């Protein structure tokens, strides 16, 4: 919960993303984005949807691995 460690996994979960949909980094969700979910911490769908820059498109498609990312460093 360590904003280090949270951040690192959402870069991490980033870089899976991008393997997975040949998109950039930009396109999956961009460094703004990534900073607020590292500082907000959502862990719900209602959570996500308040994070700026995240969007309905990317809670569809990637929203429960974010929060799965932001659970695996919280919890351990």
Known sequence: SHNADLSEALRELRRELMKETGYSAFVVFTNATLE??????????????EV?????????????RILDAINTVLDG
Not at 52 to 64: D, S, V
């Open 36 to 49: 607020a979910l590292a500082a907000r911490q959502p862990r719900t769908l209602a959570e996500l949807a």
């Open 52 to 64: 700026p820059g995240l969007g309905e498109k990317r809670i569809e498609a990637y929203g429960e």
